[model samples]
Target: SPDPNWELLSSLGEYKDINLESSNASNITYDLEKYKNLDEGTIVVRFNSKDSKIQSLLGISNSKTKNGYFNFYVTNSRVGFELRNQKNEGNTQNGTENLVHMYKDVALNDGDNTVALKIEKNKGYKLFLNGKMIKEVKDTNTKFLNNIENLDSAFIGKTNRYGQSNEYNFKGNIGFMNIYNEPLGDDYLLSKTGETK
Candidate 1:
């Protein structure tokens, strides 16, 4: 019954149906300053499509050249997120960077899908597909959300370092998207996707 810190899209209201065409690609901006260094958080996105290329659902990063980034995306029928530590860490020049790549090996069917990333401070994070747990990771080394530094650019349907490629842009209808400052429980997340009984 609470409002998300960031409501990118809401199906209940008059939300735009993001039809990402090649010539008319869609990109929405979010505030990096408002969502930086989160101790706990949850990101939920609802969409429908069947693209095999890498498509950015949502992301926040330092810069195009800088390495820090937190991205949620879908590719090759799989859902995943990339969590890389602060600048120059994920650069190709530097090896063994502090990054986490959590992906579900399962192939998602074409149609409507609701995915959520629930993150914690000390504990790792969980990836939910249609309100069901698909992937989970546990690590105490790095703060999941704190590592994403240089809170400058944020985008939906594109990356902070997005190049001149349509593959990085999502092409489909985004029903709704939300971000919460606190990590929501299974029940709450399920309710958001109508998975609760």
Candidate 2:
């Protein structure tokens, strides 16, 4: 059990691990329809990359639409987050102008590793590796999760949005994933990965 447990979803509880680089790549879908706006939360994932290409450890958004946001992801063995801000009033088809992103390099070893991301609305976010804080950014304008318009396709290991391909599908083995509506503590995150540090 973890502190401030608001909601929990575990791969071992309702889903199974699947290869995301196979011919028939699969994903674990999580229900986001119940959440109108995700102001704060934490995501903990355990996996090892098979490639360094752009891949999502977990995400929720309609990336095809204008201003659609893409959440947690990785690229070149670096952990990052991306979100597209809304454009002009009543405008659509917008692209790139307001795209906000942040990343930090970590030791994404050849074997299993654990990463934890904690986000707060109108505040900032923190990234942890194996229970240790690696990066923290205070961006008051980042509200991608709260602004996301798609609630039907949130998933683990990939983005399952319409008209989207497997370009960002995770090329690795996801051992397990835990999501909480509230940010978890350092001790809890470290304990989950069997690290005392």
Candidate 3:
């Protein structure tokens, strides 16, 4: 019996292969081959933030396909999710920025915060804020980038803007991260994050 929705990239590492590119600044990067494989459904990047100074950016290159949706997890930083669509121009969108500010002195300790990203029919691209759909944009532009085929790799700790220099490094512990190629529905997302619409 196989779990239709389950695809295991790695047996999970103790932050082992995780690379800390900079020491003076806190940032980490990994070669996807040593990590996991993103196929379909929902791509979940799980991580924990420290002191609320964590900023993470997931980069995908050498991807066989070009157009796809991406979601980031800010549960540790108490921030909202961000989404970008390469297929459509001006298709950038973001969720509630300070979603974690509402809580008092609550830090994402050791648990993992999952950010889900997927594509929907007639919906273009959609993102889930802690399992709830907070952003939706329609783009019939239909411009796709074959970059996915060339998706060399992805970055999880910091953004390319820093490029091993800036100080906007992530200040937290990353538990696990996963990527799915298929588009997930509200039900599956809510079930995973325990967040309701």
Candidate 4:
């Protein structure tokens, strides 16, 4: 299991409390105000996906620039992460867009699965899967600027996908999630999840 220090950021805006009936299926919004002081970092979100359908689970930070990064864990099924621009225009096809997929299919029991994303300026991006460096790609087409406006909140659980499109809904228990404003190194990510490189 990963030994991550997940702190409660906030429970506001279309979010149900921890004890709600559908809390597990509900989207927990976090207050991004605390991260205002951060310049560049990674957000580590840890969740347990037992036996439920999940469309998409991601942590989005609004930026005027198109470049961004993220990392997360998914058990039982395959998961993907997307980086888009203000017009919500970006890549989505497999191999065409940025994505990390699990080699084997297994349900996440009462344990921890970790994912870490690192975004370097001028450089590119890297994704750590289960403590192993899985994907590293260079992209200069989109550059993310510091024009953060709607980055005041973070979304978790299922993705809205525009309207009532509930294609993927995570049906499992999520333990804790954490957001770091600094790009996490390999050592730090491995240390948090007890995974090896």
Each candidate structure's TM-score, on Cα atoms with residue i matched to residue i, is 0.77, 0.75, 0.49, 0.56
Better of 3 and 4 by TM-score: 4
- Angstrom error of the Cα, residue 15, model 3: value is 9.8
lDDT of 4 by residue, 1-197 (tens): 12232222221222222221243444433454654334344554455555544334454444222323221335365434554324342333222223323233433335556555554544555665465555666755323323322443345654333333232445544444555544556666666544412
Write model 1 residue lDDT over 1-197, tens digit each, in one string: 23332333332212246665541344444455556767667787887655677777776765543456677888757888887655443344442245788888655647778888887666778888875777778878646556665556666676665243233667776766677776677666766664421
Better of 2 and 3 by lDDT: 2
User: Residue 183 deviation, candidate 4, in Å?
Assistant: 0.4
Candidate 3 lDDT, tens digit per residue, 154-190? 5566433312223234555545555444555567666
Best by lDDT: 1
**Candidate 1: residue pairs that collide:** none
User: Each candidate: what lDDT?
Assistant: 0.64, 0.63, 0.39, 0.43
Q: Kindly indicate the candidate among 2 and 4 with the higher lDDT.
A: 2
Worst 10 residues of 4 by lDDT: 11-20
The all-Cα superposition gives candidate 4 an RMSD in Å to the true structure of 8.1
The prediction achieving the highest TM-score against the true structure is 1
State the lDDT of candidate 2 residue by residue for 65-181, as single tens digits.
Answer: 544656578765688877654333223544434456778986666677777777766667888877678888897865646665544456667765444334367777777667666
**Candidate 2 has which clashing residue pairs, if any?**
none
Q: Which regions of candidate 3 fall more than 4 Å away from where they truly are?
A: 1-41, 51-54, 61-112, 142-151, 160-168, 195-197
Local error of candidate 1 at 87, Å? Answer: 2.9
Off by over 4 Å in 1: 1-16, 23-30, 64-66, 86-98, 162-167, 194-197
